[PDB]
């Protein structure tokens, strides 16, 4: 079978017979599990937070307010808030939030915003105009100078 080691400071280390599974129970309540598949699970007792590191670089954090975060090796971060909104942060600077009703809110580095409503209509906000596309094919644009243009469908 395995082996148990108890350190004078109270930290305990359990090792499986093959040594591929190691569980460290730190004196402060934290727990670290090293698995045979090389993933490392760390539990923070004070913060009640779980942190999983994968061999490919992926990291997952789970908070006690039911917030979860995924840090991808390519730089992408995905946050799932307690209200189940999902916010993705991309390496190129863009941000996308997906609401529970299916609405998508895209923030771009150039200051523009694109909203795709659950209704199929898209709305675009730029420095020069606000534009709303309707699924019947009509488009209304309100320019910065105040003029309003409605394009009717064919």
């Amino acid at each position: 079978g395995g082996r148990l080691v108890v350190f004078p400071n109270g930290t305990r280390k359990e090792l499986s017979a093959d040594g591929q599974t190691v569980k460290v129970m730190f004196f402060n309540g934290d727990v670290k599990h090293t698995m045979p598949d090389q993933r490392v699970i760390y539990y923070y007792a004070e913060a009640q937070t779980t942190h999983i590191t994968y061999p490919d670089g992926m990291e997952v954090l789970q908070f006690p307010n039911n917030q979860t975060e995924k840090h991808f090796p390519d730089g992408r971060k995905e946050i799932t808030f307690p209200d189940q909104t999902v916010k993705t942060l991309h390496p190129d600077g863009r941000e996308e939030s997906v609401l529970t009703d299916g609405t998508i809110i895209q923030l771009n580095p150039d200051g523009s915003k694109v909203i795709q409503f659950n209704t199929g209509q898209r709305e675009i906000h730029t420095a020069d105009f606000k534009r709303r596309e309707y699924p019947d094919g009509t488009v209304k644009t309100v320019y910065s100078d105040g003029r309003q243009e409605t394009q009717y469908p064919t």
């Binding site: 350190f7 930290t11 280390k13 460290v24 730190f26 004196f27 402060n28 934290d30 760390y42 923070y44 004070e46 913060a47 937070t49 942190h51 954090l61 908070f63 917030q67 975060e69 971060k77 946050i79 808030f81 909104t85 916010k87 939030s97």
Partner: peptide, 16 residues
């Protein structure tokens, strides 16, 4: 050889 715990985590600061 070092089995001392990690420091406390913090949620990645969000706008909303």
């Amino acid at each position: 050889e070092d089995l001392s715990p990690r420091p406390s985590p913090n949620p990645h600061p969000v706008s909303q």
